[PDB]
Every structure is written in structure tokens, then in C-alpha cells.
Design a protein around this ligand. Sequence first.
Ligand SMILES: [Mg+2]
Ligand SMILES: [Mg+2]
Ligand SMILES: [Mg+2]
Ligand SMILES: [Mg+2]
Ligand SMILES: [Mg+2]
Ligand SMILES: [Mg+2]
Ligand SMILES: [Mg+2]
Ligand SMILES: [Mg+2]
Ligand SMILES: [Mg+2]
Ligand SMILES: [Mg+2]
Ligand SMILES: [Mg+2]
Ligand SMILES: [Mg+2]
Ligand SMILES: [Mg+2]
Ligand SMILES: [Mg+2]
Ligand SMILES: [Mg+2]
Ligand SMILES: [Mg+2]
Ligand SMILES: [Mg+2]
Ligand SMILES: [Mg+2]
Ligand SMILES: [Mg+2]
Ligand SMILES: [Mg+2]
Ligand SMILES: [Mg+2]
Ligand SMILES: [Mg+2]
Ligand SMILES: [Mg+2]
Ligand SMILES: [Mg+2]
Ligand SMILES: [Mg+2]
Ligand SMILES: [Mg+2]
Ligand SMILES: [Mg+2]
Ligand SMILES: [Mg+2]
Ligand SMILES: [Mg+2]
Ligand SMILES: [Mg+2]
Ligand SMILES: [Mg+2]
Ligand SMILES: [Mg+2]
Ligand SMILES: [Mg+2]
Ligand SMILES: [Mg+2]
Ligand SMILES: [Mg+2]
Ligand SMILES: [Mg+2]
Ligand SMILES: [Mg+2]
Ligand SMILES: [Mg+2]
Ligand SMILES: [Mg+2]
Ligand SMILES: [Mg+2]
Ligand SMILES: [Mg+2]
Ligand SMILES: [Mg+2]
Ligand SMILES: [Mg+2]
Ligand SMILES: [Mg+2]
Ligand SMILES: [Mg+2]
Ligand SMILES: [Mg+2]
Ligand SMILES: [Mg+2]
Ligand SMILES: [Mg+2]
Ligand SMILES: [Mg+2]
Ligand SMILES: [Mg+2]
Ligand SMILES: [Mg+2]
Ligand SMILES: [Mg+2]
Ligand SMILES: [Mg+2]
Ligand SMILES: [Mg+2]
Ligand SMILES: [Mg+2]
Ligand SMILES: [Mg+2]
Ligand SMILES: [Mg+2]
Ligand SMILES: [Mg+2]
Ligand SMILES: [Mg+2]
Ligand SMILES: [Mg+2]
Ligand SMILES: [Mg+2]
Ligand SMILES: [Mg+2]
Ligand SMILES: [Mg+2]
Ligand SMILES: [Mg+2]
Ligand SMILES: [Mg+2]
Ligand SMILES: [Mg+2]
Ligand SMILES: [Mg+2]
Ligand SMILES: [Mg+2]
Ligand SMILES: [Mg+2]
Ligand SMILES: [Mg+2]
Ligand SMILES: [Mg+2]
Ligand SMILES: [Mg+2]
Ligand SMILES: [Mg+2]
Ligand SMILES: [Mg+2]
Ligand SMILES: [Mg+2]
Ligand SMILES: [Mg+2]
Ligand SMILES: [Mg+2]
Ligand SMILES: [Mg+2]
Ligand SMILES: [Mg+2]
Ligand SMILES: [Mg+2]
Ligand SMILES: [Mg+2]
Ligand SMILES: [Mg+2]
Ligand SMILES: [Mg+2]
Ligand SMILES: [Mg+2]
Ligand SMILES: [Mg+2]
Ligand SMILES: [Mg+2]
Ligand SMILES: [Mg+2]
Ligand SMILES: [Mg+2]
Ligand SMILES: [Mg+2]
Ligand SMILES: [Mg+2]
Ligand SMILES: [Mg+2]
Ligand SMILES: [Mg+2]
Ligand SMILES: [Mg+2]
Ligand SMILES: [Mg+2]
Ligand SMILES: [Mg+2]
Ligand SMILES: [Mg+2]
Lengths: 122, 86, 21, 80, 199
Amino acid sequence: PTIKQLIRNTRQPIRNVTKSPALRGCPQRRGTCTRVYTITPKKPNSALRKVARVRLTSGFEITAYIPGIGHNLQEHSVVLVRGGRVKDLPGVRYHIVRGTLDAVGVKDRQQGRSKYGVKKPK
Amino acid sequence: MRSMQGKVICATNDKTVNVEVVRLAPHPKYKRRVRKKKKYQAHDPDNQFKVGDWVQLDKCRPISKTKTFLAVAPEGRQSSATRPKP
Amino acid sequence: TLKKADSAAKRTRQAETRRLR
Amino acid sequence: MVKLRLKRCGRKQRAVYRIVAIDVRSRREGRDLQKVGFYDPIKSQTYLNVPAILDFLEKGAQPTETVYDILKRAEVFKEF
Amino acid sequence: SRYRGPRFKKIRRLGALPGLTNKRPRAGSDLRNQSRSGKRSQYRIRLEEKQKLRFHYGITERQLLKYVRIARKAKGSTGQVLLQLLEMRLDNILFRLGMAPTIPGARQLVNHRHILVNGRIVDIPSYRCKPQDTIMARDEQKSIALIQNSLDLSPREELPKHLTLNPFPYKGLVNQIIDSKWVGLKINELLVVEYYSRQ
RNA sequence: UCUCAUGGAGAGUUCGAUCCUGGCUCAGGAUGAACGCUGGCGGCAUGCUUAACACAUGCAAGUCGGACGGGAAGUGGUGUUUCCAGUGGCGGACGGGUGAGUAACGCGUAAGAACCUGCCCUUGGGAGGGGAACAACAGCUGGAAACGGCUGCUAAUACCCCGUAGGCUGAGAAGCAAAAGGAGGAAUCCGCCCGAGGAGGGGCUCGCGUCUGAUUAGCUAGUUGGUGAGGUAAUAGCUUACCAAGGCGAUGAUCAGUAGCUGGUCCGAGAGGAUGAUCAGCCACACUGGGACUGAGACACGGCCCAGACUCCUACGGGAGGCAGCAGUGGGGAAUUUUCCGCAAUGGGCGAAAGCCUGACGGAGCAAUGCCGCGUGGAGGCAGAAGGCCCACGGGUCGUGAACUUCUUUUCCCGGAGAAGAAGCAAUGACGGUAUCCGGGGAAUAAGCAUCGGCUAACUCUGUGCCAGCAGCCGCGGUAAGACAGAGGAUGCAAGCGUUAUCCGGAAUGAUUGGGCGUAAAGCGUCUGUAGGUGGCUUUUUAAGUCCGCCGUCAAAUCCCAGGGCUCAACCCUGGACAG
Ligand SMILES: [Mg+2]
Ligand SMILES: [Mg+2]
Ligand SMILES: [Mg+2]
Ligand SMILES: [Mg+2]
Ligand SMILES: [Mg+2]
Ligand SMILES: [Mg+2]
Ligand SMILES: [Mg+2]
Ligand SMILES: [Mg+2]
Ligand SMILES: [Mg+2]
Ligand SMILES: [Mg+2]
Ligand SMILES: [Mg+2]
Ligand SMILES: [Mg+2]
Ligand SMILES: [Mg+2]
Ligand SMILES: [Mg+2]
Ligand SMILES: [Mg+2]
Ligand SMILES: [Mg+2]
Ligand SMILES: [Mg+2]
Ligand SMILES: [Mg+2]
Ligand SMILES: [Mg+2]
Ligand SMILES: [Mg+2]
Ligand SMILES: [Mg+2]
Ligand SMILES: [Mg+2]
Ligand SMILES: [Mg+2]
Ligand SMILES: [Mg+2]
Ligand SMILES: [Mg+2]
Ligand SMILES: [Mg+2]
Ligand SMILES: [Mg+2]
Ligand SMILES: [Mg+2]
Ligand SMILES: [Mg+2]
Ligand SMILES: [Mg+2]
Ligand SMILES: [Mg+2]
Ligand SMILES: [Mg+2]
Ligand SMILES: [Mg+2]
Ligand SMILES: [Mg+2]
Ligand SMILES: [Mg+2]
Ligand SMILES: [Mg+2]
Ligand SMILES: [Mg+2]
Ligand SMILES: [Mg+2]
Ligand SMILES: [Mg+2]
Ligand SMILES: [Mg+2]
Ligand SMILES: [Mg+2]
Ligand SMILES: [Mg+2]
Ligand SMILES: [Mg+2]
Ligand SMILES: [Mg+2]
Ligand SMILES: [Mg+2]
Ligand SMILES: [Mg+2]
Ligand SMILES: [Mg+2]
Ligand SMILES: [Mg+2]
Ligand SMILES: [Mg+2]
Ligand SMILES: [Mg+2]
Ligand SMILES: [Mg+2]
Ligand SMILES: [Mg+2]
Ligand SMILES: [Mg+2]
Ligand SMILES: [Mg+2]
Ligand SMILES: [Mg+2]
Ligand SMILES: [Mg+2]
Ligand SMILES: [Mg+2]
Ligand SMILES: [Mg+2]
Ligand SMILES: [Mg+2]
Ligand SMILES: [Mg+2]
Ligand SMILES: [Mg+2]
Ligand SMILES: [Mg+2]
Ligand SMILES: [Mg+2]
Ligand SMILES: [Mg+2]
Ligand SMILES: [Mg+2]
Ligand SMILES: [Mg+2]
Ligand SMILES: [Mg+2]
Ligand SMILES: [Mg+2]
Ligand SMILES: [Mg+2]
Ligand SMILES: [Mg+2]
Ligand SMILES: [Mg+2]
Ligand SMILES: [Mg+2]
Ligand SMILES: [Mg+2]
Ligand SMILES: [Mg+2]
Ligand SMILES: [Mg+2]
Ligand SMILES: [Mg+2]
Ligand SMILES: [Mg+2]
Ligand SMILES: [Mg+2]
Ligand SMILES: [Mg+2]
Ligand SMILES: [Mg+2]
Ligand SMILES: [Mg+2]
Ligand SMILES: [Mg+2]
Ligand SMILES: [Mg+2]
Ligand SMILES: [Mg+2]
Ligand SMILES: [Mg+2]
Ligand SMILES: [Mg+2]
Ligand SMILES: [Mg+2]
Ligand SMILES: [Mg+2]
Ligand SMILES: [Mg+2]
Ligand SMILES: [Mg+2]
Ligand SMILES: [Mg+2]
Ligand SMILES: [Mg+2]
Ligand SMILES: [Mg+2]
Ligand SMILES: [Mg+2]
Ligand SMILES: [Mg+2]
Ligand SMILES: [Mg+2]
């Protein structure tokens, strides 16, 4: 407002706060699954969601969502996790990239296959 | 370049004076001008200058861990001497 | 006997003698 | 010392040189005092600015072989 | 990097596209289902304008974009300058001199080294043509044969006054820069520009 | 209706509706990017961001026999010529790598005065007479090795003395100081010593600009100044003794935290925000700390000494070593390449030259990492048939699409010829028999990936039934789902297409340009007042701002404009300039 006041540095910006701190400024991180289990979603959305707790290379433990239909993942599995938020579940900020490391690609998905890590059928 | 005119804050020490220089600068973002005041250790042999004086400040070889500057008689100033009134 | 370090050794010794001088 | 030499520019397989007055201990493309001539093998383009060359040769600048011979063809060593 | 798909289709949706096809579309036979999108969002209109442009000249989008940057750079009326740039393309001047059936044909011609610009062989379609320029056929049997049969059997004499053609050697000559009224299609450049405000 | 402008877009979400304040979310660009699916080619770039964590192997700095004494290869022998440890000479302080430390005159910019300077120019004078050593070598000897120990021996451009000196000390008187020869048959050449200049490279000093924190408020005693003695290439608390009590600080000292800085890069309508890879300049570092020595130049990456930590060899008594040089291995990690070729070009080092050495550099290889170009066919093709899908069973649609007929050969394949790059005596090309050019086959060798509820371009059907699942936000899904999964269809881009991460935008959402404070977040409870900021009219002065002209500079590369060159473009090159 008052110039005199602006010259006391009364304008300071609000820094950008990341949505996936556990990644520490990376596209992906590799992790090991501590636990694999299911959780119920915030109402009125009821279903049963597939989530696994992953301990990462950056040391954190987070809870990440597993997309697609069905999975082979079990404890002491080395997966790769990526960003992005599931609006449903509280606290879950991370997915699991399908088709790499220990997470196989979704079986018999014919469309938008690149998202789920599936070969092209001949 | 252009020498710096200032006024004397402290005459106490020997062959030295402590000068305050006020200069105006157009602050980088908000374009108003501001007074920035800095202090200098000025070398003055003969100790001619007292407290309150208005003195021009000149550049030379280092005489100490601080004083680089020679105390010099005021360069030009508007006479405070009374003038005719036509 | 064939000794190869010119720079190293030679400059070292030279440095000693000159240092005494 | 001050040397008048070639500094290499242009791209892979296609080379073009500037003729420059620069202290001998700087790198081959490094910073310099003055740019003087221009040179290139493939377009067979060569020309120089003579007052500069002479002003540096006067103050003792050594040319390098290639450069020396370029100055020879343009007759800068006769005026000297 | 070239559009090898069905033409007639894009024609039906977009409009009349000279540089694509000389065959007039079917009655369209969509009067059965009478399926429509309702009407078109302003966005769809603008998009179809750009698509019109792009498919008439055989250009890729990312290419069109840099053409547009060139355009925004140039000092003058943007859309016009753009249309200049699009219309001075080699396979296009080749086509519009009737040395080719259509733009894919002309592109094919250019690509196979059957053409000469000032006694120099240019096989790339997007070569930009400048004033006072000679468009020749290569002197070989096949090149001459192609250019002759595609020139003569097509009766159209529209030549848009910046383009000269001479009979026996078949020396094409680009005389000058295009005029906005002499352009090769019906388009509001305003719309394509407005689409490209967001890049 | 001259001149200026080539530039500023919105959408959904609080409600039963509305208007508003307000956040969240999306559409755009950009990567040193990674991951998924897919992948034909060429052009120019790019390629350990994390662990400045460890390093096996090989190579990255030498040269001079025209400074010198030797000995070893030959030859018949000191006519010829080679190599070689050693002493000396210059070079190893440049080039290469990395960003840990550094909030500082470290960097950018502009000034200054007390300095230094091998090689290179320009110039003024000189090079008399002696002597003594030390390696090498020899003999004896200690060591597993590394490397040594005694006694002899010898040359020099290597060491020491004397004579002379336009220099140094000093008020002066006076005092003091130098040399080296080697080539050639001679002319002459390359050197040497002392001055005096020049240019370039360095050392200092100062103005200005140079991150966040007040839940960091006092800090500093060689600290801030003075003298006297020392010291430095030179000014200086650089050092030391004495005298004085200053110096910095609420305009943020000190302390803590982060960070190499700048040309620039990305974004922005602009004002300005974020960042500092490649490319160019500067600083700083070289296993962790500290020293100096040599030298014109270092407190020295591939030198020395010590301590420390760690690795190796050892016949166990002792030694050896420092990839943040090029490649390469381990390890960390989402992630980043061959233990390649060559001195031919340019640049360095040494040399009288011949020439030698150059993992600087020039090139190749690997990788869609990125930008750019081209292709995967062109023209015709009954409106008849097979098939998918939709269908009120009439038909619609995949669809001129394919099949099919002709034309063409960029790319593919098989043969031929084949550069410039090389610089003025010929010779000499790693790339490479590559770029390009001529012939012969033949549509032949080559299309995927997202999306289709709204923003947002593109829709129907079967399968499922608050399940399985989707989702960037709103939110879909409980029997006919345009929002899930499948199919067909369409749309968008295209050798790429998507997802995640990072930054600016949109955001007027930290507001100078550009916001607010009666009730939406927001006026100290009310005064008095110190610093601080603004301050009535008239005349004069000055000229600090302000304004105009001229000069210096703000490196080149980048951005902008104008041409030129690789077939075009990307890229490269020349010339020039607004800003500020
Ligand atoms: Mg305001
Ligand atoms: Mg944002
Ligand atoms: Mg030539
Ligand atoms: Mg398709
Ligand atoms: Mg925009
Ligand atoms: Mg409410
Ligand atoms: Mg509602
Ligand atoms: Mg608002
Ligand atoms: Mg985007
Ligand atoms: Mg693959
Ligand atoms: Mg690093
Ligand atoms: Mg080794
Ligand atoms: Mg070698
Ligand atoms: Mg010899
Ligand atoms: Mg030799
Ligand atoms: Mg010699
Ligand atoms: Mg002999
Ligand atoms: Mg030898
Ligand atoms: Mg020896
Ligand atoms: Mg170095
Ligand atoms: Mg260096
Ligand atoms: Mg490099
Ligand atoms: Mg750091
Ligand atoms: Mg600090
Ligand atoms: Mg400074
Ligand atoms: Mg400062
Ligand atoms: Mg400095
Ligand atoms: Mg020397
Ligand atoms: Mg002489
Ligand atoms: Mg003598
Ligand atoms: Mg003497
Ligand atoms: Mg001597
Ligand atoms: Mg001889
Ligand atoms: Mg002789
Ligand atoms: Mg001298
Ligand atoms: Mg900065
Ligand atoms: Mg003391
Ligand atoms: Mg803005
Ligand atoms: Mg780097
Ligand atoms: Mg650099
Ligand atoms: Mg150092
Ligand atoms: Mg290390
Ligand atoms: Mg050390
Ligand atoms: Mg010394
Ligand atoms: Mg070294
Ligand atoms: Mg050291
Ligand atoms: Mg090393
Ligand atoms: Mg030790
Ligand atoms: Mg050691
Ligand atoms: Mg050693
Ligand atoms: Mg390495
Ligand atoms: Mg590994
Ligand atoms: Mg690993
Ligand atoms: Mg990679
Ligand atoms: Mg060479
Ligand atoms: Mg050379
Ligand atoms: Mg030489
Ligand atoms: Mg090699
Ligand atoms: Mg290289
Ligand atoms: Mg390959
Ligand atoms: Mg490529
Ligand atoms: Mg490739
Ligand atoms: Mg990829
Ligand atoms: Mg492309
Ligand atoms: Mg066709
Ligand atoms: Mg053919
Ligand atoms: Mg070609
Ligand atoms: Mg030749
Ligand atoms: Mg051929
Ligand atoms: Mg729509
Ligand atoms: Mg979907
Ligand atoms: Mg997103
Ligand atoms: Mg229902
Ligand atoms: Mg049912
Ligand atoms: Mg259903
Ligand atoms: Mg039905
Ligand atoms: Mg679906
Ligand atoms: Mg489908
Ligand atoms: Mg992408
Ligand atoms: Mg803003
Ligand atoms: Mg805010
Ligand atoms: Mg507001
Ligand atoms: Mg209230
Ligand atoms: Mg209130
Ligand atoms: Mg009140
Ligand atoms: Mg109140
Ligand atoms: Mg109060
Ligand atoms: Mg008051
Ligand atoms: Mg007051
Ligand atoms: Mg006032
Ligand atoms: Mg007034
Ligand atoms: Mg510049
Ligand atoms: Mg241009
Ligand atoms: Mg051109
Ligand atoms: Mg330029
Ligand atoms: Mg200016």
C-alpha cells in the first residue's frame, strides 16, 4: 500500500509446496512393499481399494494405490512408484507403475495399454 | 571519478576523521529514491577539521586497515553569506 | 637400468641442490 | 606472449576460423583482445583487416605458421 | 509424416479441398440417421479452419506452428503473411502451375528428384520459393513424360498472375509474392490466428 | 482517419436458485528429464543432476646430442651414423576435470596507485683473468624389493673469486655489483650480462550492485586508529612494542541456514518472476588437514615433507599409492555411452632445423534425449461382391478404403566411379573408399499412441451391477452406464504418443504498472511524541536529481534486424543496432 512500507519488504511470495514430498524431486522412486492390504473409501463411494505400504529409497514410508484389475504383488516385492493423487482415499498420494520391476502388466487389457504396462497383441 | 562530499561525525582520533556520506538512490523495484548513509575513515594530517564540518572526500593509497580516503577542503558550496536583495 | 621419470625426479634433486645454495 | 592465430568455429566437418589477437596462454577458443581476420579452406574465403595486423605486429605479436603464411599471401610482411 | 488416410472423408467434414481431391463427394447419404453434434462450439469452428489449411497443403502441425511463429515475427498483417508462407511451398507452386494432379502427386514428384530450381535439384517439398525463380523438369525421359501428360490432359487455365508457364521446354517461372486475393482456398485467416493465440 | 502498435481469452467447483469475496483444479510453454507402449531414415546437438563415495588395468608432459663428460649399437675401426641413463636448459603454474567450500572486493561493473613480470618486440652498453667442486663412470659394499653406503674420478651454457659498470644504498662522503659459450671453412646465426622502454599476463585498493531468518541484539580488544622498530614485489595491524578509545549496529551488526558468481537459459502483453547443464569468462579445490622448497610465475591435480584415514606389494626387516584427466569396474540411484582411431586439421611444449610428445583437440561408435527434414506410395478404381459393426430389418457405416489397373524409386537392395577438407616445394587425410554422382531391379523394405461426461475436438452397442474398476477438479458405477471393461466407429497428434517430476504462466492469488480493510480475511482501545517520510505562496542562487548533445566502455557466442552458405530447415558465417 504505502510505498514507504513496501520498501520495508512487505511483499514476499508464497513458495510452491510439492504434492509428493516423499519423492524428493523425482519422476519415480523404487520401493519395497512392507504390507499389502485393502481399505474402504470415503463415503459415498463404497468399494474395496487395493493399496500397499511402501518403504522407499528416500527412507520414507508411504501408502500407494495399485491401479488396474488384479495384481500379483506381495510383501518384500520391489516396485516402482510414481506421483498423482487418489481423491478417494485419505492420505494416499502415490500410484504404482504397472509393468516394471515386480508389478506385472494388467492381464488382458486391450485399450490405453501404455498406462497399465501391457504388450501389444499380435 | 567524482569525489564524495560528506559531513564529520567524529573527530576524536588522531590524523583521522569519521565521515558520514549521504547519497540518494532510485530503489531497484519501487522507483522512489532513498537516502543511504555510509561511514568512512578519512585520513586528515594536521587535524584541521572539527565535529560538524562539511568536507569533500578524496581517493588515494591505503593508509591503514581502513582509511583509503584523504580529507579535503569543501569543494564547492553555496555561500551562506548574505547576498543583495534586488 | 633404465629410469623413467624426468620431470619428477630430476626437478626434485635440482630443487634440493639449489636450495642449499 | 601475444599471438595472432586461428580460433576454430563452425560445425562438425565444416570448419571456419577467426584470426585473432590473443595472449598465448589462453585456450584455443578462449577470450581475446581483438578480432582481426577471417579464414576458411572450403569456400576458399580469406581476407583480413590490415591496420590491426600491423598494429599488433608492431607491438611484437608472433603469428603461427598457418597465419604467418596467410599474411604472406596478402603481402603484410613487405609493408613491415 | 504424411497423410496417407482416406481423403473423401476429411473432405466431407471440412469442405472443398482443391489440393486434395478433384472428385466431388458423394451425396453424403447421412440423411438417414440424421446424426449431428447439434451445432459446433466456437472451438470446433476454429479447429476446422486450421484443419482445412493444414490438409489442403499436406503440412504437419508442428510445422504449421513454426510457420506461425515466423508469421508473428514478420512485420505486417499476420494471417496474410502466413498464407504467403504456405503458398510459396514448392510442391504447392508445382501443383498450382498444373504440373501435377494434386498436392500428394506434386509432393511425390518433388521427392523423387524430378524437378529443378534454377538448374539445381531440390527433392524436399517444403523448399520455399522466392521471386524470379525457374521451375523446370529434369531433362530425363520419365520426368518430361510425367510433367507433359499431367500438364496437357488437365485443361484448367486459372494461372494466378504471379505464375508464368512457357510451352516447349516447359519452363515454369515464379514472378513475385502472392496476393491475399490470389490465395488457393477460401479461408478466414483470422480464425486460424485466433486458434493459435494459445500455441 | 495519418502515425504507433504484432501483444493481456477463459472453464468447472460452495447455493434450492442469485450476486459477490475467496481458495482448489484445468487448458499453454519448457526440460541435462525418467517410465510405459510403439518405433524406417538422415542433418545438427546432447548424454552421473544422486555419493567432492571407493577404485583393478592401460594411457593423459615432456622435449634439447648444436650446453657437457662419458658407454652402447653397429662400421672397420674416431670417415658414417644412431640410440641412451646422468649433470645442465627451458616446460611441468598452460591445457583437462569438478562445484565441496566461499554471503566474500569471491563475482559483475566503474574507478585508482604504492607494484611485479620468464617467453615476444623496441632500444643503450658490454662480455677480461683465474680457481674449486659434484654426479656420471670405476672399485669395494648394504638391501627380497624399493632404494641405498663408503672411497677414488671427471666435463660444461653447472659452482666460487678478482678487475671494470649511465644501476642500487646514502644529505653527502663514499660504498657495492656482471658475464657463457655453441654452431659454420669464413660471412654470419642461436645465445649470455647490465640498464631503459612496449605490449600482454599477474598482485593489490576503493564506489556501486551481489540470497532467507528478530522465536538471531549487542558484537569486536591486534579489535578501530597514532608513533617507533621490523616485514613484504608493493600500500596495509601484514608483524611487534608503546600510546589513545575507538570501529561496526534496529537502513539488521554479530550468530545461524542455504548457495560457486556472471555473460546467459526458460517463461512473461509488459513491468519483471524462476534458474546458472552443454557453450564462453572469473573464482575455488585436487584422499582429509598443515607446511614450505624450486622458480618470472605455485603455497603447485599426474612434485616434495609431515600427520591422519584407507588400499596394495613384502623374502615382514620395510616399501608403494591418490581417476573431481580419457575411457573402464564396483557402489548409490528413477536415471546418463566405447577399457575405439588418429596427430591429417586447429592450439600448445621443447628444438638451429629435421622432428618428437600432446585421451587439449579432430573424428568415429552407442542412445528417439532433444530440435529439424524426409519417407512409409502417386493417379485411376463397376458403385458390383466377401466381412466387421449399427439397424425401427427398409437400410446405414467401415469405404475409393482394400482387392484391382497403370505411373514413379526419395528411402531399401546389387554393382560401379568418388571429393573439398592441405596450409603454395613436392609430399603429407584419422575421418573413409564416407559425403556426393551414374546404372540395374522392384509398390517394392517400413504406423503407432492417446482421447471420445463438462472444461475439450470426437458416440453408439454388448458385458458388469455401490461389485470389478475410473478420476486433473466437479464427481461416475445399486438393470438398458455417451464417465467402468470389450467391440465397432470417430477425433487429435504423428515416428512419436502418453504418464510422473521440476519451473514460469494463467493468478489482479503478495497488487510499482495492478488489490484491499463499515458487515466477506483485515483500523493498533486511546492519545503524547523521537528517528523516518511527505510539506503552502513569491523572488534569487546553485546544479545534486531531472533533461539534451558528444566520448569511453558494458568480451566473443546467444536474443533482435539485414544478407550469405550447407539441396531446405535446424545449424554455421558476415555486418549492424535499439534498449538499459
Ligand atoms: Mg498499489
Ligand atoms: Mg502453479
Ligand atoms: Mg583451398
Ligand atoms: Mg486411426
Ligand atoms: Mg500466451
Ligand atoms: Mg456457505
Ligand atoms: Mg449443488
Ligand atoms: Mg478471486
Ligand atoms: Mg503440458
Ligand atoms: Mg524398445
Ligand atoms: Mg556431480
Ligand atoms: Mg593404476
Ligand atoms: Mg601416447
Ligand atoms: Mg642429431
Ligand atoms: Mg634426437
Ligand atoms: Mg642450444
Ligand atoms: Mg661423427
Ligand atoms: Mg638421454
Ligand atoms: Mg645414471
Ligand atoms: Mg592447472
Ligand atoms: Mg585449468
Ligand atoms: Mg569438456
Ligand atoms: Mg555447495
Ligand atoms: Mg554464514
Ligand atoms: Mg571490486
Ligand atoms: Mg560490497
Ligand atoms: Mg580479485
Ligand atoms: Mg628461468
Ligand atoms: Mg649487442
Ligand atoms: Mg670472464
Ligand atoms: Mg665481485
Ligand atoms: Mg654464473
Ligand atoms: Mg656440426
Ligand atoms: Mg667449429
Ligand atoms: Mg628489460
Ligand atoms: Mg542469483
Ligand atoms: Mg599490541
Ligand atoms: Mg502477467
Ligand atoms: Mg557438469
Ligand atoms: Mg568452463
Ligand atoms: Mg590453489
Ligand atoms: Mg575420491
Ligand atoms: Mg595439501
Ligand atoms: Mg623464490
Ligand atoms: Mg602439476
Ligand atoms: Mg599440495
Ligand atoms: Mg590424477
Ligand atoms: Mg603418511
Ligand atoms: Mg605417502
Ligand atoms: Mg611419491
Ligand atoms: Mg572418468
Ligand atoms: Mg553399476
Ligand atoms: Mg542400482
Ligand atoms: Mg537416457
Ligand atoms: Mg598437431
Ligand atoms: Mg601444430
Ligand atoms: Mg619456437
Ligand atoms: Mg590413442
Ligand atoms: Mg572432443
Ligand atoms: Mg540404432
Ligand atoms: Mg535421430
Ligand atoms: Mg536412429
Ligand atoms: Mg523413451
Ligand atoms: Mg518430426
Ligand atoms: Mg490412393
Ligand atoms: Mg528406377
Ligand atoms: Mg537425400
Ligand atoms: Mg599439396
Ligand atoms: Mg539408385
Ligand atoms: Mg464436444
Ligand atoms: Mg477413461
Ligand atoms: Mg497433471
Ligand atoms: Mg438403474
Ligand atoms: Mg442382465
Ligand atoms: Mg448395460
Ligand atoms: Mg437394444
Ligand atoms: Mg469405456
Ligand atoms: Mg477400439
Ligand atoms: Mg513427451
Ligand atoms: Mg504474479
Ligand atoms: Mg495467496
Ligand atoms: Mg481481495
Ligand atoms: Mg462475522
Ligand atoms: Mg471482520
Ligand atoms: Mg478505532
Ligand atoms: Mg478491532
Ligand atoms: Mg496495544
Ligand atoms: Mg502525534
Ligand atoms: Mg520531526
Ligand atoms: Mg524537505
Ligand atoms: Mg512547492
Ligand atoms: Mg555481446
Ligand atoms: Mg535470417
Ligand atoms: Mg539458404
Ligand atoms: Mg553477430
Ligand atoms: Mg548506453
